[PDB]
Amino acid sequence: QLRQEAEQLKNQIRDARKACADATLSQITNNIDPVGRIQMRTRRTLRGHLAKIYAMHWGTDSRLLVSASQDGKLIIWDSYTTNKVHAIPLRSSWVMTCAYAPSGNYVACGGLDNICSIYNLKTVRVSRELAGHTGYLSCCRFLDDNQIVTSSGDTTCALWDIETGQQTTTFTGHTGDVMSLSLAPDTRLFVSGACDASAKLWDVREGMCRQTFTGHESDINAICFFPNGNAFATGSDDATCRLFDLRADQELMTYSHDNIICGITSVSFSKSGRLLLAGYDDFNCNVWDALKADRAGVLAGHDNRVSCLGVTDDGMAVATGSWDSFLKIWN
């Protein structure tokens, strides 16, 4: 029909993308030496959760962290001494995400209930309850101490205002569910990975989509952002991690193996960006190489699937959360 009339555009853009690629990154990256085998041993273990753990977020001081479980409790830990600091009961027992404010004063958590809640650490009681989404919340990140950006299960993303409790900007354009997002270091652009095997780049100030990527062929579960600010990596259910690029607007490498057929739940980078860490459903975690694609190590020790992952700001340790109700600190 009429729609079919410009379905060609897509073909023209694909041809332009093909013409853009002079050579693969792999060839460019061939001369540099390999990092080699990297051995990491657990240092601390945290106990106290009565159910499976769904999300966690490292603090801005590289000391404290927060976690959420299906028992309906948020616990703020202390990494150095492994002693609990706070324990906040929840009205709703189903939570799917949590976040920690950059200023270190607020914690937010949302779940299957279509509500995003914000707590005040220094006063621990509910400070605000944001409503308006028609689907479950999948991720949320503090843009600042006064405004927060959230992604929901109704194929939309919104930028909220804490003081007024009303939406400011609404992002639309996806077809499937939105599962994860990440913020740029400059806090000006953010990316999201939908359930329709597509990733998009949004502009917070303008409020309009800028670029689109559709390399994957299955559901996208996690997404991370390169430290430089000009690339991002994502992981899908087809056991493949892909590194895209903002300027080139196309894929540069693929991380996959023939001995793994399980899904991918979390993706994270290192301080230097050389190491890419991804958690799988194979009851363990894998450490890749951002450039060469070689595997450089495995992080085993969890009795159930891994559903969280994070790296500290100074990069002194990496934390993993699993459905075994245990948090582990690696180094």
């Binding site: 106290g48 002693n83 600091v85 324990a87 299960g153 569910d177």
Partner: protein, 223 residues
């Protein structure tokens, strides 16, 4: 260095609170109420009484029921429930994409889900009186919409042979899917309920007890 003692005291208080909460967490049982639209789920939950939680206690046992659509992805969070309650309209076989065929397709999709390998299903076949009136009144035949009814014969314990065949055919259609790939890890408990019924909660209690007993028997290699 005096802050360490305060931190230890706070940790002790939090640990005591968590220890207190663990028992009440382990005492309760969770049920997921999943049903297709227009089936009658609201009537059932009202009789029992973006989310709804219901509290009820039977014989000093605390139960906890939850109610919640395409490409269901939130269902992964419900792999630790005791049982799944399914409510389907038995008389909506011609209120057309037959409404029933959608129900059987949904049941087949839920049964074969990877995360629900060890979760049993309690099935309620609602709206029996409408089905009886529809089959008795004529001008509507099960064979017209479901061709397989021609080659079906009564297996049985009657509570009018035609309505008995109508009741049992729908039950067997779900039971076939139930037993196709059960593998002994989870079963299904068919039931024949209506709007005007009493002690539906007793059925749920008995089926939960049966599920727990069967799981415990299988764990010790006795079944």
């Amino acid at each position: 260095r005096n802050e360490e003692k305060a931190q230890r005291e706070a940790n002790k208080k939090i640990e005591k609170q968590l220890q207190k909460d663990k028992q009440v967490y382990r005492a309760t049982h969770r049920l997921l109420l999943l049903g297709a639209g227009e089936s009658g789920k609201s009537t059932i939950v009202k009789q029992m009484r973006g989310i709804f939680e219901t509290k009820f206690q039977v014989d000093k046992v605390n139960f906890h029921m939850f109610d919640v659509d395409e490409r269901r992805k939130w269902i992964q969070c419900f792999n630790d429930v005791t049982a799944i309650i399914f409510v389907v309209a038995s008389s909506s076989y011609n209120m057309v994409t037959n409404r029933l065929q959608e129900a059987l397709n949904l049941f087949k999709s839920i049964w074969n889900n990877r995360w629900l390998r060890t979760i049993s299903v309690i099935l309620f076949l609602n709206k029996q009186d409408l089905l009886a009136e529809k089959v008795l009144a004529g001008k509507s035949k099960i064979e017209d919409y479901f061709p397989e009814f021609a080659r079906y014969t009564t297996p049985a314990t009657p509570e009018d042979p035609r309505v008995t065949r109508a009741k049992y055919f729908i039950r067997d259609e779900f039971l076939r899917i139930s037993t196709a790939s059960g593998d002994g890890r989870h079963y299904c408990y068919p039931h024949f309920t209506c709007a005007v019924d009493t002690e539906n909660i007793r059925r749920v209690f008995n089926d939960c007890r049966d599920i727990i007993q069967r799981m415990h028997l299988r764990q010790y290699e006795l079944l």
